[PDB]
């Protein structure tokens, strides 16, 4: 009977018959969590209450240090939430994310907290969490690096600059604490990410340039492939530098597009790469000039 004993206990609570407001508002749930982790997401998910998430919140926050260590406590909660979200209908889903955000706020490990702030994409929520990621240890160590890399990396932008919704608010705060101006901002901005891309490129190997033919309708295709394949640092550098060949021969809206696609390759460079984009801006027809701005945007996300 003993092996089964832990699961049946928590399996029974899932039902949550009659009273739904409990009598305790911490529930009997707490000792069972440490022993069995499988039963628990079944309970939160079927229950599909914000109240369910309240009971789970109080017990994980205390349990963090005391029961065993911080590291296992952190692990137990992340799994539980994951089953539960699918089962909850959308108006209520936002409420559970915030409730979870509080359990994490205290915790030494931030990862799951950032996901919850991302889902919402709220200005205020993301600010609160960020300041909290850095605060635990004033030394750079896990705390600052975890917060900075994890929140910033997250996507919401097709261009490689990731979020940047967080970026302006979070940065002023990080330089103020002072571990250096250059370190906080360098990680925070896309500059560090430009290097790590470069190094990975070699191992993976490259499909060659996106050039095919510079004559006929094929010149339009050539233009488009360069943009699609690489939104980062290429190895197709040699074709883009030489603007005159690819970019000009282009017809109709493809001219604008050729000029855009060139910015994708130049993205992760702006310490010399900027100058051509500006030549294109001054000169010629509207399609090319407008293309150069779109492209500038792309480069100035580096």
């Amino acid at each position: 009977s003993w092996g089964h004993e832990y699961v049946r206990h928590l399996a029974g609570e899932v039902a949550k018959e009659w009273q739904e407001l409990d009598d305790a508002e911490k529930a009997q749930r707490e000792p069972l969590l440490t022993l069995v982790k499988e039963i628990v997401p079944y309970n939160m998910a079927h229950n599909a209450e914000h109240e369910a998430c309240d009971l789970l919140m109080e017990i994980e926050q205390v349990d963090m240090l005391e029961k065993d260590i911080d590291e296992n406590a952190y692990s137990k909660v992340c799994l539980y939430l994951t089953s539960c979200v699918n089962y909850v209908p959308e108006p209520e889903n936002s409420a559970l994310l915030r409730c979870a955000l509080g359990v994490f706020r205290k915790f030494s490990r931030f990862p799951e907290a950032l996901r919850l702030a991302l889902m919402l994409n709220d200005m205020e929520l993301v600010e609160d969490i960020f300041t909290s990621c850095k605060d635990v240890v004033v030394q750079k160590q896990m705390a600052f690096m975890l917060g900075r890399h994890g929140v910033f990396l997250e996507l919401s932008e097709d261009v490689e600059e990731y979020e940047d919704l967080t970026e302006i608010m979070s940065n002023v705060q990080l330089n103020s604490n002072f571990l250096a101006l250059a370190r906080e901002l360098d990680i925070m901005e896309p500059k560090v990410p430009d290097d790590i891309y470069k190094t990975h490129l070699e191992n993976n190997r490259f499909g060659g340039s996106g050039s095919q033919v510079d004559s006929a309708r094929m010149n339009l295709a050539s233009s488009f492939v360069n943009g699609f394949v690489n939104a980062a640092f290429g190895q197709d550098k040699l074709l883009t530098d030489d603007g005159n060949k690819w970019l000009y021969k282009n017809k109709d809206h493809g001219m604008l597009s050729a000029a855009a696609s060139l910015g994708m390759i130049l993205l992760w460079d702006v310490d010399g790469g900027l100058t051509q984009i500006d030549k294109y801006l001054y000169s010629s027809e509207d399609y090319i000039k407008s293309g150069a701005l779109l492209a500038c945007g792309i480069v100035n996300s580096g």
């Binding site: 003993w2 092996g3 499988e38 997401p41 079944y42 799994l79 089953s83 699918n86 089962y87």
Partner: protein, 385 residues
């Protein structure tokens, strides 16, 4: 575990929606208003009478005529009377014929015979790697050959190694030959064909070899597919003898299977998982390496391997957790993988005999002995003679 249970909540909603959604799309709301669409539905009703006869298309000629064998009466030289083109058709397929005038109305059914019905266990098992009682390394050999080229060609092309056309499993028996075949088959989520070797042996003249080649044809239409030839030795090199109509039969069904798998080269049309309980005392005429490349041999579990089979098992069970898994294995002597499974099952049943509900440390000890005894009586014991 948790994940497996969750998939079921989505699937419960899915059945309900799919049955309603089917209705609007299939027709009677997408009722043919299109010249192409209406023409096929209306024309086949008019040509068709009832009854009809099934046939299998023996060969086609490129002048819009073909030769078929109908189930009833003679064969017919039929024309392609409307509908399907030449390309669509292939020999070895089953096609539908009107009795009024035998002609190929079409196939889109991937055949239809009573034979195909037995072959298609098409809907996958829930059995999957590490739901098996198996050895970690042994399943991962079956996967490497059969499964992996389809899933990632990447590793095989860079490395520069040749993809096989099947594999072969052979005993010492009681090693989960069949369990392995079912585990891989679920993972591909490709149609799983199955036939037992004795069905292919018969005392009728010539029927057997049609079925053996037929397995590869049915599979090809469905393809990708994995074709499970259960107990290959049965058609092959294990006796039906020379005095029951085996004398002709075995040699033909065995030979027929052996030549296509071999071809003239390793064809690589459809993958095969072949299970045999031995090739140990049986005669040569079976598929050799370098057409099916890797041939997988099973051991007889040692102490170290027994850890991997046992840990999987102890989870469904209980109160062998209290006592260390390592010590339990050490104590027991060497036995085959079915035997190990049998001890564990028997532990659950013997508690019920004791007047207890389920496995205890004591029940687990006794079950080990009982199986061991069967084997020790059956075959040689300890110290020399």
């Amino acid at each position: 575990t948790q994940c497996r249970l969750k998939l079921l909540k989505l699937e419960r909603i899915k059945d309900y929606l799919l049955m309603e959604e089917e209705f609007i799309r299939n027709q009677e709301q997408m009722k043919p208003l299109e010249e192409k669409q209406e023409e096929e539905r209306s024309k086949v009703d008019d040509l068709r009478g009832t009854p009809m006869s099934v046939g299998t298309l023996e060969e086609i000629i490129d002048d819009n005529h073909a030769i078929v064998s109908t189930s009833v009466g003679s064969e017919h030289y039929v024309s392609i009377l409307s509908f399907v083109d030449k390309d669509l058709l292939e020999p070895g397929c089953s096609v539908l014929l009107n009795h009024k005038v035998h002609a190929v109305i079409g196939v889109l059914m991937d055949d239809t015979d009573p034979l195909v019905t037995v072959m298609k266990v098409e809907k996958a098992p829930q059995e999957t790697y590490a739901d098996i009682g198996g050895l970690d390394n042994q399943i991962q050999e079956i996967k490497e050959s059969v499964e992996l080229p389809l899933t990632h060609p990447e590793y095989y092309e860079e490395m520069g190694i040749k993809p096989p056309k099947g594999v072969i499993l052979y005993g010492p028996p009681g090693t989960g030959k069949t369990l392995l075949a079912k585990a891989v088959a679920n993972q591909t989520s490709a149609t799983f064909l199955r036939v037992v070797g004795s069905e292919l042996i018969q005392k009728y003249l010539g029927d057997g070899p049609k079925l053996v080649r037929e397995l590869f044809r049915v599979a090809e239409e469905h393809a990708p597919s994995i074709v499970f030839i259960d107990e290959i030795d049965a058609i092959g090199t294990k006796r039906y003898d020379s005095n029951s109509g085996g004398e002709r039969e075995i040699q033909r069904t065995m030979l027929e299977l052996l030549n296509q798998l071999d071809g003239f080269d390793s064809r690589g049309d459809v993958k095969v998982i072949m299970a045999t309980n031995r090739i140990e005392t049986l005669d040569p005429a079976l598929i050799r390496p370098g057409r099916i490349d890797r041939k997988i041999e099973f051991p007889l579990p040692d102490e170290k391997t027994k850890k991997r089979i046992f840990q999987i098992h102890t989870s469904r069970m209980t109160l062998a957790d209290d006592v260390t898994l390592d010590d339990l294995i050490m104590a027991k002597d060497d036995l085959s993988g079915a035997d190990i499974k049998a001890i564990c099952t028997e532990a659950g049943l013997m508690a019920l005999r004791e007047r207890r509900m389920k496995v205890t440390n004591e029940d687990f000890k006794k079950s080990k002995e009982n199986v061991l005894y069967k084997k020790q009586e059956g075959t040689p014991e300890g110290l020399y003679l």
